[PDB]
């Protein structure tokens, strides 16, 4: 009576049914791929691509489909926001339906392989017992793997035949799926260099093909074969688990730290961007330029794109979220409606006061207004018995340039303090928290969720490698 | 040799020498465990003895500075270094030992060498076990300690700004790290930590109960007060009565182990399971994905001022910890909070 | 030889009757000479705060740290 945690060990020595069980897993994965996509498409709003991006709508699979090219939809809408003139068979819905049909086909294939498990192919010719030439099996699979890798990078990514990959400006203000050209240089190893993807996939692909030929031709060393139990299926399983958990960590870091493969306008902005004021510096930069040109403060702030300002918001920060705060980013803060405009806080003396932005590590941060020198000149005191920086005594007035409150000045202590609290959270945008009944708490972006899930899987798979690997090394002792 | 007879190679020579009965089992793993562990622990001693964090954390952390065993600690590098590996030849120290120590390079040295040391130690467990021809359950059990170290000393620091927000190698340093997590991450409320605490407390209960039961159900195999004398290292019969023990706990607690194997397997499963659970929780904190508070009660407390629970009370405490330590705990933030802005309760 | 056998060999004691004392003395001289402060750049009790900076030093430039830390240390 196999224990519950040893029931799937029945096919360990049944190559015919091993394919079947693997076919099942592949079918389930394919089905979820199309199923989740169909669900997301059914719950996605493409009306506003600026203040309501996919990552704000909590979409997870949609970003990946868009990353490789899928942009139009049979709904007559493009992820760009324009009408899908001809979405074609490869519409978001089409690709989803394809995966679902593939799942079904895999299921029927699994049934056949399960029923007809006793195939002479699995049997070894010398003895007749079921035996798999793991050495060659890896070689043939590696050769095929290399082919696809090179083809994807030299065609789909390059664009010669494939549609292309999603590339965006450093500030993700403007980007789409355009054919890229392999860098083939030192810059090719820059994670934010899109060209690297094509160059790397082409290089890695050709090598993989050659490596596959080697494993197919050259046989394993006698000392290596026994030393690495190259005759054990669990041996490849343990080593394969090591590879998947290794990649998971690399993939997660790429998503968290950001890269050309993780567009900020497809997965949302990275936490480090806010920590370094990436978008904020740009906004102020162009503003200063417009002022240098001679435009009024309103003109400069009016020039600022709402999308750029939207990026400059603690809410879009992926780290600003909770483990059980489930739902789309739109829920918890509302659906962005518009930009109130830049808020300028000035004391009675006329000194310009800057509201210290909330550090990501801080769930709640005290409101502080500092001068250009960096000296606190005003704040909202917790104790008002004898304040020395009270917004009232300092007499701070907030004037909004550009946006909805363009040209609007506020001197009411309460009104100024309200905007000051928003200012510390970055650009002040209008949000509709009624349609979704937002709870008023920030949520994590799909970027953060993906990183958390894959890092967790990676850490667990480490135990899997040690477990299956230990069993292979101590097979004699574990034998029973 | 090799179920075929092969010519001996230099590997066979080195193999026999490394895998040779010796005061201590060097083996092949020892080539990684012995050197890395020595540098790691040695660096920690040198750092705690004569190394200052005056330029990294602006804190005195060395016996030479006048710190004691509890206060002395190898502090993390400045947040300016970010996730820089900070090698002695790195673009920062530029081959300056004095500056490399002043920049907090020793912390990375100890952590990196210690991390590989743990890998070598686990490899040693497999090596020795394979030579003894026994299942390497001990090595599989050592996965939990390694997982905790990687998640708390690597994953978390990487998920945050830099190595600066990582556990510094010191008694007081670990204490402030623990307090920081409560004030900012509310680690206590995290369900994964809860499961982890259960494992450590449960394992301690198992260890104590097992020792007490066995030492109290021992058979009289001697004619002296000292029962320890009445035991043979190569005895076959169990020194204690599993039956008597089973009945006692069956009547005192209502349930009792009847299989020695299952009992010991449970003794090793509880602790390992708990550590791995807490590690997953730390992974979430790295990305700031934490169970800080329940929105349902937060909304009720805001709308209904009177409504109050220990949960709301703990939230306020966390608010104080963050506001009354951020100025120093995070000097890079350069946060000067006027005393009036700081949250203080009535009196006090 | 068991450690106890060596811990009883008076010869072993004579062998370490000079080396061990020297090892300790060297450690005392190391700190007393002030070499420790220079070797590990540990600030002496009179050089923690310079006339220029009367506050704890904060390194802000990662690739410009070498010069920064030296300036913070007042060279």
């Amino acid at each position: 009576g196999l224990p519950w945690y040893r029931v799937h060990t029945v096919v360990i020595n049944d190559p015919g049914r091993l394919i079947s069980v693997h076919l099942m897993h592949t079918a389930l994965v394919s089905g979820w791929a199309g199923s989740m996509a169909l669900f997301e498409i059914s719950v996605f709003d493409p009306s506003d691509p600026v203040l309501n991006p996919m990552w704000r709508q909590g979409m997870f699979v949609l970003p990946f489909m868009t990353r490789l090219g899928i942009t139009q939809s049979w709904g007559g809408w493009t992820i760009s926001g324009e009408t899908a003139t001809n979405p074609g068979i490869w519409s978001y819905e089409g690709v989803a339906a394809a995966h679902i049909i593939l799942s079904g086909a895999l299921f029927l294939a699994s049934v056949w392989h399960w029923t007809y498990w006793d195939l002479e192919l699995f049997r070894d010719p010398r003895t007749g017992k079921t035996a798999l030439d793991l050495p060659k099996i890896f070689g043939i699979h590696l050769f095929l793997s290399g082919l696809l890798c090179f083809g994807f990078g030299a065609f789909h990514v390059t664009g010669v035949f494939g549609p292309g990959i999603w590339v965006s400006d450093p500030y993700g203000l403007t980007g789409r799926v355009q054919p890229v050209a392999p860098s083939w240089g030192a810059d090719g190893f820059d994670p934010y260099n899109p060209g690297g993807i094509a160059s790397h996939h082409i290089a890695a692909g050709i090598l993989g093909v050659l490596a596959g030929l080697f494993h197919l031709c050259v046989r394993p060393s006698i000392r290596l074969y026994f030393g690495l139990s190259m005759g054990s299926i669990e041996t490849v399983l343990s080593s394969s688990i090591a590879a998947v958990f290794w990649a998971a960590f690399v993939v997660a870091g790429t998503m968290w730290y950001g890269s050309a493969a993780t567009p900020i306008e497809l997965f949302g902005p990275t936490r480090y961007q806010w920590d370094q004021g990436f978008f904020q510096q740009e906004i102020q930069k162009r503003v200063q330029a417009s002022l240098a040109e001679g435009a009024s403060l309103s003109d400069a702030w009016s020039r600022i794109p709402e999308k750029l300002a939207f990026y400059d918001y603690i809410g879009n920060n992926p780290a600003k979220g909770g483990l059980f705060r489930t739902g789309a980013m739109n829920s918890g803060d509302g659906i962005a409606v518009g930009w109130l405009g830049h808020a300028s806080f000035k004391d009675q003396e006329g000194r310009e006061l800057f509201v210290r932005r909330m550090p990501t590590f801080f769930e709640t941060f005290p409101v502080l207004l500092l001068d250009k020198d960096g000296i606190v000149r005003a704040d909202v005191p917790f104790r008002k018995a004898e304040s020395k920086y009270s917004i009232e005594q300092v007499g701070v007035s907030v004037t909004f340039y550009g946006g909805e409150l363009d040209g609007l000045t506020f001197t009411d202590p309460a009104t100024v303090k309200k905007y000051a609290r928003k200012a510390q959270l970055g650009e002040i945008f209008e949000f509709d928290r009624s349609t979704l009944q937002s709870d008023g708490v920030f949520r994590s972006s799909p970027r953060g969720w993906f990183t958390f899930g894959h890092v967790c899987f990676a850490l667990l798979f480490f135990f899997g490698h040690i477990w299956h690997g230990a069993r292979t090394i101590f097979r004699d002792v574990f034998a029973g | 040799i090799g179920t075929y007879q092969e010519k001996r190679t230099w590997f066979d020579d080195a193999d026999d020498w490394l895998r040779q009965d010796r005061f201590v089992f060097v083996g092949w793993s020892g080539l990684l465990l012995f050197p890395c562990a020595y540098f790691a622990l040695g660096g920690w001693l040198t750092g705690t003895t004569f190394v200052t964090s005056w330029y990294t954390h602006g804190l005195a952390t060395s016996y030479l500075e006048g710190c004691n065993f509890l206060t002395a600690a190898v502090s993390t590098p400045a947040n300016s270094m970010a996730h820089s590996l900070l090698f002695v030849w790195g673009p920062e120290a530029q081959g300056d030992f004095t500056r490399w120590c002043q920049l907090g390079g020793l912390w990375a040295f100890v952590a990196l060498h210690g991390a590989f040391g743990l890998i070598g130690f686990m490899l040693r467990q497999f090596e020795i076990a394979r030579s003894v021809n026994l299942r390497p359950y001990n090595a599989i059990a050592f996965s939990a300690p390694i997982a905790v170290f990687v998640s708390v000393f690597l994953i978390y620091p990487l998920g945050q700004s830099g190595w600066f927000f990582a556990p510094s190698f010191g008694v007081a340093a670990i204490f402030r790290f623990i307090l920081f997590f409560q004030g900012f991450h509310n680690w206590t409320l995290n369900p994964f930590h809860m499961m982890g605490v259960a494992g450590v407390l449960g394992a301690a209960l198992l260890c104590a109960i097992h020792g007490a039961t066995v030492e109290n159900t021992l058979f009289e195999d001697g004619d002296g007060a000292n029962t320890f004398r009445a035991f043979n290292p190569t005895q076959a019969e169990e020194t204690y009565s599993m039956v008597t023990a089973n009945r006692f706990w069956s009547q005192i607690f209502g349930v009792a182990f009847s299989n020695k194997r299952w009992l010991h397997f449970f003794m090793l499963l509880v602790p390992v399971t708990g550590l791995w659970m807490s590690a997953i929780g730390v992974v979430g904190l790295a990305l700031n994905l934490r169970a800080y508070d329940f929105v349902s009660q937060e909304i009720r407390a805001a709308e209904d001022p009177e409504f109050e629970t220990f949960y709301t009370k703990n939230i306020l405490l966390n608010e104080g910890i963050r506001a009354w330590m951020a100025a120093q705990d995070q000097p890079h933030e350069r946060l000067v909070f006027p005393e009036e802005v700081l949250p203080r309760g009535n009196a006090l | 030889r068991p450690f106890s056998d060596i811990l009883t060999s008076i010869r072993y004691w004579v062998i370490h009757s000079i080396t061990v004392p020297a090892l300790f003395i060297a450690g005392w001289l190391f700190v007393s000479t002030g070499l420790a402060y220079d070797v590990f750049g540990t600030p002496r009790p009179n050089e923690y705060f310079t006339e220029d900076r009367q506050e704890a030093p904060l390194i802000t430039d990662r690739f410009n740290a070498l010069e920064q830390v030296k300036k913070l240390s007042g060279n």
């Binding site: 920590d275 370094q276 004021g277 990436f278 904020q280 510096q281 102020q284 930069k285 200063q288 002022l291 310009e352 800057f354 509201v355 210290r356 932005r357 550090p359 500092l370 001068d371 250009k372 020198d373 960096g374 | 947040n79 300016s80 700004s161 890079h332 933030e333 350069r334 946060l335 | 802000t60 430039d61 410009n64 010069e67 920064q68 300036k71």
Partner: peptide, 23 residues
């Protein structure tokens, strides 16, 4: 007015502009 840094720093002391070239 104030320089971008004279604005980014008071708003965010850990901004790259303020955390760079500081030497």
């Amino acid at each position: 007015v104030t320089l971008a840094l004279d604005k980014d720093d008071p708003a965010k002391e850990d901004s790259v502009k303020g955390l760079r070239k500081d030497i």
